[PDB]
Ligand binder design. Structure first.
Ligand code: CLA
Ligand code: CLA
Ligand code: CLA
Ligand code: CLA
Ligand code: CLA
Ligand code: CLA
Ligand code: CLA
Ligand SMILES: CCCCCCCCCCCCCCCC(=O)OC[C@H](CO[C@@H]1O[C@H](CS(=O)(=O)O)[C@@H](O)[C@H](O)[C@H]1O)OC(=O)CCCCCCCCCCCCCCC
Ligand SMILES: CC(=O)O[C@H]1CC(C)(C)C(=C=C/C(C)=C/C=C/C(C)=C/C=C/C=C(C)/C=C/C=C(\C)C(=O)C[C@@]23O[C@]2(C)C[C@@H](O)CC3(C)C)[C@](C)(O)C1
Ligand SMILES: CC1=C(/C=C/C(C)=C/C=C/C(C)=C/C=C/C=C(C)/C=C/C=C(C)/C=C/C2=C(C)CCCC2(C)C)C(C)(C)CCC1
Ligand SMILES: CC1=C(/C=C/C(C)=C/C=C/C(C)=C\C=C\C=C(C)\C=C\C=C(C)\C=C\C2=C(C)CCCC2(C)C)C(C)(C)CCC1
Lengths: 210, 167, 73, 177, 92, 91
């Protein structure tokens, strides 16, 4: 009695109807990429392909069980990883040039080794960073168990409310900006993990400079 | 409206029903937890501070029992502990405090109409009627609060500098 | 006295969200306090675990004098 | 609703003034839990009377050995006048024979203690009961209350005595050494 | 002495043979499952189990070489698992 | 304690538990719960760090006021759970 092939093991009157309701499809999410559909014949335009990419079909694994996450949760996690990786790749690129904050007797921000850069700082300096991340990731996360089971109502995936007003009013341009976000995030994820892999095993990224 | 803080109104639980109600509760602690426990604790602290203040003052102005060590009230605690009388008084107050466990349980559960800080000590029927009870309870709680602050000042001055009844 | 906890209340209101563990631990207080066999089983399981623990710990950390050299005991 | 002994605590539900020496003194509620269980207070009252009588006898017999005298001393010359030392200094004959006397007395009492006698009055073993024939029921209650009060006092006194002899070795107003 | 904890310095001891066995065992299980799916649709499944239709059975053995993709596809299409209330279960 | 003397605390149908589960703390505001939780966690972490990490714990000299306060970390956990419960209860 729902999209799932099986009724949820959660009982009736205590969640079953909440899990087993209709859920939005992957096609209604701004993630399609023209580059994958960049070949003669079939193809897309404006940086978006006509269909999304999912060879392993992780998006529609909810139909097997509600243990697996919903596409809302997956988009939330994708945007989170992309944003974190964008900040991370920008940080390593800026730090490796040698630019650093002034410092004083107590703190010395002079370290180009991005892997061991946090280790040089005093306990307080990185403690504040980790505490801020811990509080914010945990305060901004409300209704994420709702995005897992699929109820994109209270929370939109990726909309923390930070600067959401600058999104254009036109649907086409808003989707264009969201797609630019997703593409840059995915590129930054690949870049930061490639630099990390190059560091751990040399030669993983031949174009490396760090 | 709260009288102590005239920029905001008093909580729902401070209603005059209790003695010494100036509408002072900026933190809503008595709205967060039962107010009878608060009043009983306030009374107990104040009585202990009243007796502590007068005892400190007398021991500093020479008032000792026969067979007692002539020592300032600052070191009176240590010397009385060494003598052992401290533990006897500990047992004496512990009896009343366990009876106070029972009394507080009955008060909060409503098994009896016990007022907070009430052990039914009225040899002279000083408050056998309602208006006498209101007046004498307001006067006590005032003395409780004042002596609490006064003894905090005294003992501290004594532990900080000097000695004697004045400080 | 008033202070303390109610095991019935604790068990009844320990239920995770969205019915993960069904209705939770509702009725377990009633079944345990009514059935002596469940209590006996819990006690026997705990005591068997404790007996295995003492067996595993006496040889590893002997507490009695000269027992380590007494191999038969 | 409130105890007459502790006027800021509830009256014990079990105690209702139908017993000698009832002043509502039961903070812990032994009578209350016994009544919830189903038993009566006859056992505790009779045990109270037993302990009180024994404490009175013990108090007098502990102030005596060193007051009016340690007997004519046929054999008690060697037994120390210190009461806590005398117990470990009684001879085998006297010790065993006091033991068997109290044993036969207690064994005789045990049947009427744990029996189902409905006419049994608590603390009525028939020993010296002839004097109660003359007196009236109000006087009987007064005399039983006096007995209970004396036993209650002696239970605590003795307890003090024993500890004073143990830790100080002498009572303050008497038994100078 | 063989070290089986995950270190790739000693991969050949357990990790590589482990994946080899997993592939072969999944091959066997997939061939069996697919033959059962065929044989049930037949008019006489009971006799098809004890007298194997070898011409199609060999086909299933061959086709089971690509079982990890076939299993994933059937899982996504909801044809690997039978729903839960279509399988007998005893009185609880 | 009898079976009858127990409030109905089961909340499986609801999305959040009732404030009755907090016991004496049922009436405590969520803001007070949260701020006290933060203070408790900070103080307990400080006490544990000064007892064990910053100074290696020596048997001869242990402060005691650092052993106390280390228990506030579980207390901080309970306080922030109760803060969430009161926030969802709107109390
Ligand atoms: C871990 C980060 C992450 C996450 C959570 C997602 C999530 C998503 N991506 Mg994907 N994506 C990622 C990284 C990620 N992506 C990267 C690095 C790229 C390559 C540039 C892409 C490129 C991409 C495209 C082109 C498209 C998507 C789309 C999607 C959606 C559908 C597919 C799905 O179910 O993915 C679930 C994801 C996972 C379960 C991650 C599993 C990872 C496995 C274990 C391999 C890891 C290998 C390791 C790096 C070596 C979903 C929102 C589609 C979309 O949005 O359509 C609307 C779409 O069109 N993604
Ligand atoms: C520990 C002692 C103590 C206690 C238990 C109480 C309890 C009470 N006072 Mg307070 N009071 C005290 C000391 C105390 N008082 C002192 C010293 C003064 C200054 C003279 C006052 C002056 C005062 C006034 C004028 C009034 C009250 C009232 C109240 C009641 C409500 C306010 C409240 O939140 O309570 C306090 C709750 C607490 C948890 C107490 C501790 C607070 C913090 C944690 C202590 C640390 C702060 C600081 C460093 C010291 C309550 C019965 C009101 C009343 O009568 O209502 C019926 C009222 O009108 N009090
Ligand atoms: C009604 C019973 C009773 C009486 C009349 C006394 C009387 C006395 N006790 Mg106490 N005492 C009692 C019960 C009693 N005790 C009990 C039950 C215990 C055990 C908890 C003690 C344990 C005790 C000790 C250990 C000491 C006294 C001492 C004293 C003397 C001084 C204390 C005081 O202020 O009085 C005094 C003669 C002191 C004493 O006699 O010194 C020689 C002393 O050191 N008593
Ligand atoms: C019992 C728990 C446990 C589990 C679940 C794992 C799991 C893993 N270990 Mg192992 N490992 C364990 C205990 C465990 N380890 C212990 C106790 C040690 C210390 C001796 C190691 C030391 C160890 C090393 C040195 C390496 C692994 C690696 C691995 C990975 C092997 C992947 C593969 O070959 O396919 C995998 C995630 C490898 C890894 O990290 O691959 C990325 C690897 O190189 N493990
Ligand atoms: C993720 C798991 C989880 C969750 C979400 C909850 C949620 C809840 N529990 Mg808890 N609980 C858990 C695990 C969990 N529990 C475990 C593992 C235990 C067993 C130890 C308990 C034992 C327990 C009891 C006994 C009770 C609750 C209750 C509650 C409710 C009040 C929470 C609160 O702030 O109390 C905590 C508030 C505090 C101020 C902190 C308490 C003191 C700390 C933890 C210890 C202090 C030191 C210690 C006393 C001394 C040292 C030895 C709430 C529904 C109450 C209820 O009604 O349950 C249905 C209740 O009475 N829980
Ligand atoms: C993980 C275990 C656990 C959990 C979840 C709880 C949870 C709870 N206990 Mg606790 N409790 C525990 C272990 C636990 N307990 C243990 C091991 C013991 C034995 C020592 C107790 C003994 C105990 C008692 C005796 C009582 C509680 C009560 C409570 C409630 C307190 C509500 C509160 O803080 O209001 C907010 C707090 C206040 C208004 C008062 C604050 C006063 C100061 C700040 C206390 C500081 C104490 C701290 C340890 C230091 C709550 C449901 C109370 C209750 O009503 O339970 C139903 C209660 O009376 N507990
Ligand atoms: C009354 C019981 C008792 C006694 C007499 C001692 C005595 C001793 N302990 Mg302690 N200890 C106890 C209980 C006790 N312990 C308990 C319950 C624990 C927790 C398991 C410990 C854990 C412990 C450790 C790990 C160590 C000692 C050590 C010591 C020595 C110095 C301690 C000191 O100076 O503290 C002075 C402190 C005070 C006067 C105030 C203490 C007040 C506490 C914190 C109140 C709260 C208690 C809490 C609610 C109970 C639960 C435990 C909780 C902390 C998890 C001394 C021999 C040290 C030693 O001998 O090393 C060789 C040492 O390393 N103890
Ligand atoms: C502040 C710290 C703790 C305050 C005391 C809590 C309390 O008084 O109990 C709350 C309940 C009453 O509320 C009760 O509230 C309860 C509501 S419910 O059943 O839990 O839903 C219920 O028991 C009943 O309605 C009501 O009587 O019982 C009492 O108030 C009397 C007990 C107080 C005396 C016994 C111990 C004294 C305090 C212990 C020491 C504290 C440690 C420091
Ligand atoms: C054949 C035969 O005999 O039939 C019997 C039958 C029958 C019915 C039984 C009879 C009876 C009556 C009997 C048996 C009467 C017995 C009476 C008896 C033997 C009564 C002692 C009381 C002692 C008390 C209260 C002690 C208080 C003690 C206290 C409070 C103290 O002194 C305290 C103190 O000590 C401390 C703790 C420490 C010291 O530092 C200080 C002091 C000293 C102050 C008959 C009719 O007579 C005869
Ligand atoms: C049928 C039945 C029954 C029975 C049951 C049983 C018999 C059971 C048993 C069980 C068991 C017998 C269990 C056990 C378990 C265990 C566990 C679960 C453990 C854990 C552990 C831990 C957690 C640990 C940790 C740690 C520490 C703390 C330290 C060191 C390190 C480590 C990590 C080790 C009953 C009666 C109930 C009734 C109903 C039905
Ligand atoms: C790496 C490694 C390791 C680890 C491991 C682990 C930790 C594992 C886990 C595992 C797990 C935890 C698993 C789970 C699972 C689950 C499930 C749920 C399953 C399912 C399945 C199925 C269903 C199947 C099916 C099929 C197919 C597909 C083929 C053939 C036929 C059949 C039908 C059978 C160690 C350390 C040892 C060392 C060595 C290496």
């Amino acid at each position: 009695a729902g999209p799932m092939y099986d009724e949820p093991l959660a009982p009736s009157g205590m969640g079953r109807e909440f899990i087993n309701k209709e859920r939005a499809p992957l096609s209604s999410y701004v993630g399609a990429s023209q580059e994958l559909a960049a070949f003669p014949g079939g193809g897309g335009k404006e940086g978006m392909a006509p269909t999304p990419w999912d060879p392993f079909c992780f998006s529609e694994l909810y139909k097997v069980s509600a243990n697996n996450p919903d596409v809302a949760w997956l988009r939330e996690s994708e945007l989170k990883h992309g944003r974190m990786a964008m900040l991370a790749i920008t940080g390593v690129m800026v730090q490796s040039t040698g630019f650093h904050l002034p410092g004083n007797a107590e703190v010395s921000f002079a370290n180009s080794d991005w892997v061991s850069a946090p280790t040089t700082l005093p306990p307080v300096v990185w403690g504040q960073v980790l505490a801020f991340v811990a509080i914010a990731e945990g305060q901004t996360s409300e209704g994420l168990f709702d995005l897992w089971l699929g109820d994109t109502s209270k929370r939109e995936p990726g909309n923390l409310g930070w600067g959401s007003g600058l999104l254009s009013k036109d649907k086409k341009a808003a989707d264009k900006m969201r797609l630019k976000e997703l593409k840059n995030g995915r590129l930054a994820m690949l870049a930061i993990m490639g630099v990390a892999a190059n560091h751990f095993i040399p030669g993983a990224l031949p174009g490396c400079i760090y | 409206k709260s009288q102590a803080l005239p920029f905001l109104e008093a909580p729902a639980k401070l209603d005059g029903s209790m003695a010494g109600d100036k509408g002072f509760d900026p933190l809503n602690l008595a709205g967060s937890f039962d107010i009878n426990w608060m009043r009983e604790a306030e009374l107990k602290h104040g009585r202990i501070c009243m007796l502590a203040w007068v005892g400190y003052v007398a021991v500093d102005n020479g008032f000792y029992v026969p067979f007692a060590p002539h020592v300032s009230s600052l070191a009176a605690h240590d010397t009385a502990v060494k003598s052992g009388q401290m533990l006897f008084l500990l047992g004496a107050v512990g009896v009343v405090e366990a009876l106070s466990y029972n009394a507080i349980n009955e008060m909060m559960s409503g098994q009896t109409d016990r007022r907070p800080g009430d052990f039914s000590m009225d040899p002279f029927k000083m408050v056998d009627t309602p208006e006498k009870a209101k007046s004498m309870l307001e006067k006590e709680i005032s003395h409780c609060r004042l002596a609490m602050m006064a003894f905090s000042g005294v003992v501290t001055q004594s532990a900080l500098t000097g000695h004697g009844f004045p400080y | 006295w008033g202070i303390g906890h109610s095991m019935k209340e604790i068990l009844d209101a320990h239920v995770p969200p969205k019915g993960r563990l069904g209705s939770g631990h509702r009725g377990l207080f009633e079944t345990i306090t009514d059935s002596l066999h469940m209590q006996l089983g819990l006690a026997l399981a705990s005591l068997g675990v404790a007996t295995s623990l003492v067996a595993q710990h006496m040889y590893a950390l002997p507490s009695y004098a000269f027992m380590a050299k007494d191999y038969v005991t | 609703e409130r105890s007459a002994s502790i006027p800021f605590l509830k009256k014990p539900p079990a105690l209702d003034g139908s017993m000698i020496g009832d002043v509502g003194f039961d903070p812990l509620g032994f009578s209350t839990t016994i009544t919830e269980l189903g038993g009566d207070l006859s056992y505790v009252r009779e045990a109270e009377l037993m302990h009180g009588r024994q404490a009175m006898l013990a108090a007098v017999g502990m102030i005596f050995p060193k007051v009016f005298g340690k007997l004519p001393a046929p054999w008690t010359e060697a037994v120390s006048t210190n009461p806590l030392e005398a117990q470990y200094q009684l001879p085998p004959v006297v010790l065993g024979q006091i033991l068997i006397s109290i044993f036969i007395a207690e064994g005789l009492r045990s049947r009427i203690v744990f029996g189902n006698d409905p006419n049994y009055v608590v603390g009525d073993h028939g020993f010296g009961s002839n004097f109660l024939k003359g007196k009236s029921e109000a006087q009987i209650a007064d005399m039983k209350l006096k007995e209970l009060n004396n036993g209650r006092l002696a239970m605590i006194a003795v307890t003090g005595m024993f500890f004073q002899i143990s830790i100080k070795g002498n009572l303050w107003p008497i038994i100078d050494g | 002495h063989l070290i089986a904890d995950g270190r790739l310095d000693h991969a050949g001891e357990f990790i590589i043979p482990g994946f080899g066995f997993l592939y072969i065992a999944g091959w066997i299980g997939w061939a069996g499952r697919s033959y059962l799916q065929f044989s049930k649709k037949t008019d006489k499944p009971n006799e098809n189990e004890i007298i194997i239709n070898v011409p199609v059975a060999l086909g299933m053995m061959a086709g089971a070489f690509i079982w990890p993709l076939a299993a994933w596809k059937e899982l996504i299409d909801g044809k690997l698992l039978v729903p839960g209330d279509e399988i007998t279960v005893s009185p609880r | 304690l009898d079976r009858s003397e127990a409030a109905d605390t089961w909340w499986g149908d609801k999305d959040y538990p009732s404030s009755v589960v907090l016991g004496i703390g049922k009436d405590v505001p969520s803001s007070i719960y949260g701020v006290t939780s933060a203070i408790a966690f900070s103080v307990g972490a400080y006490c544990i760090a000064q007892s064990n990490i910053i100074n290696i714990l020596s048997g001869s000299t242990v402060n005691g006021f650092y052993v106390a306060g280390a228990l506030l970390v579980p207390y901080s956990w309970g306080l922030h759970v109760a803060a969430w419960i009161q926030k969802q209860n709107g109390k």
